Design an enzyme around this catalytic site. Structure first.
Site, short mmCIF file in Angstrom:
data_model
loop_
_atom_site.label_atom_id
_atom_site.label_comp_id
_atom_site.label_asym_id
_atom_site.label_seq_id
_atom_site.Cartn_x
_atom_site.Cartn_y
_atom_site.Cartn_z
N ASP A 51 0.16 1.78 -2.93
CA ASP A 51 0.78 0.53 -2.72
C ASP A 51 1.59 0.01 -1.43
O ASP A 51 2.22 1.08 -2.23
CB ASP A 51 0.36 -0.19 -3.79
CG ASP A 51 0.45 -1.77 -3.67
OD1 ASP A 51 -0.76 -2.27 -2.66
OD2 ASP A 51 0.73 -1.92 -4.01
N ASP A 75 3.21 -3.51 -1.04
CA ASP A 75 3.15 -4.50 -0.84
C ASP A 75 4.02 -4.61 -2.26
O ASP A 75 3.08 -4.47 -3.60
CB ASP A 75 2.42 -5.90 -0.92
CG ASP A 75 2.33 -6.30 0.43
OD1 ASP A 75 2.61 -6.78 1.09
OD2 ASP A 75 0.74 -6.47 0.82
MG MG Z 1 1.36 -4.21 -4.91
#
Ligand code: MG
Length: 364
Positions: free
Chosen positions: A21, A23
């Site tokens: 991922d 963010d």
């Molecule tokens: Mg995230």
């Protein structure tokens, strides 16, 4: 031929697959223009911790609304990706747009050596609410590990290593969380909601408001580098890789290469050691009317070996309480032999893969 051959290639390379991922896992992003002002001023209290921040502009929506995004890379990122890439073939899987993912990858991986084109985004993942291993590995997930700050987007998959959300830009959350959990809406509505959210963050300057308040009252500096999550995460990922390959050597040799190891079995076994023997009762943490056992907090705790109970009929080991003024607290205290702790005991313990001293988390 591609899928089954990649699995075979990865075993020859003695690597696994890692889905990363962006963010709040490896970066923190904001559009608050305060950051550019602080970056432009070597005298600012925040300047030193911003020196490594990088930015880019994107045009968004049908009107080409433009925003400058400021990206902080989590401490130790470059070294983390180099070392982990020796053991795992890296992919990005973000809920941000393809253009956003590409801009981030251009900064973290300019020549493409770390991720190549293995970048999956909202434009091409197939969902704006959930992520799926099967989008990348439809038939065999036995070698894929995920790092993400959110468990809900993965339905608490056994191959997930949930990480502590990275919050460097204090008070800024996840700028790409707009559509998590929801039905698909018309692009027209999605674009309107996005531009509205971005405009709000730019106009409200939350970083400035928070920093001004601190100064009106390091202690007075808003932004700090105090995050060491990647150092911890590297150790976990190295352990998973080594256990996998030791198990793979054993299982494949005994089965004439017909059977193999599976990280989806390995990882739960490691996690279940952490809160083994705990039996948790929540008080005031899950909203009244919400199913406790299917809640994110309960699923997270159970993935680390905790049992969750709903009453005192078999006394819990811990009462995880939000407020001291409840009958469940009074009862646990009156019964004795039950640890009454703040929610932070559980979330910090799960975060650290280590049960922390309850005495550090008493309620008052
Ligand atoms: Mg995230």
């Amino acid at each position: 031929r591609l899928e089954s051959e990649n699995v075979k290639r990865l075993r020859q390379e003695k690597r696994l697959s890692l889905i990363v991922d962006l963010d709040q896992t490896i970066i923190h992003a904001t559009v608050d223009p305060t950051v550019g002002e602080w970056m432009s001023d070597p005298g600012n209290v925040n300047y030193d911790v911003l020196r490594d921040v990088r930015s880019f502009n994107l045009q968004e929506g049908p009107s080409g609304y433009t925003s400058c995004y400021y990206i902080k890379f989590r401490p130790g990122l470059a070294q983390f990706l180099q070392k982990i890439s020796e053991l795992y073939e890296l992919h990005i899987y973000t809920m941000g747009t393809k253009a956003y993912a590409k801009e981030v990858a251009k900064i973290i991986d300019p020549t493409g050596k770390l991720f190549q084109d293995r970048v999956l985004s909202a434009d091409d993942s197939g969902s704006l609410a959930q992520k799926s291993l099967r989008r990348l590995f439809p038939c065999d997930t036995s070698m894929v590990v995920v790092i993400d700050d959110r468990g809900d987007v993965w339905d608490w998959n056994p191959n997930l290593i949930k990480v502590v959300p990275y919050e460097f830009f204090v008070g800024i959350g996840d700028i790409n969380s707009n559509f998590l959990g929801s039905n698909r809406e018309a692009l027209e509505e999605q674009n309107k909601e996005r531009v509205t959210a971005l405009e709000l963050q730019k106009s409200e300057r939350p970083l400035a408001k928070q920093q001004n308040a601190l100064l009106e009252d390091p202690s007075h500096t808003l932004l700090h580098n105090r995050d060491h999550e990647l150092e911890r995460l590297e150790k976990v990922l190295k352990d998973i890789h080594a256990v996998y390959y030791e198990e793979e050597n054993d299982i494949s040799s005994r089965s004439g290469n017909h059977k193999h190891a599976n990280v989806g079995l390995i990882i739960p076994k490691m996690k279940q050691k952490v809160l083994k023997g705990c039996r948790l009762l929540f008080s005031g943490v899950i909203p009244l009317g919400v199913d406790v056992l299917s809640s994110d907090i309960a699923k997270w705790a159970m993935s680390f070996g905790a049992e969750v109970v709903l009453d005192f009929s078999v006394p819990p080991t811990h009462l995880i309480a939000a407020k001291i003024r409840t009958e469940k607290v009074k009862k646990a205290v009156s019964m004795g032999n039950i640890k009454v702790v703040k929610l932070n005991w559980l979330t910090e313990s799960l975060s650290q893969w280590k049960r922390l001293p309850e005495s550090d988390y008493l309620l008052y």
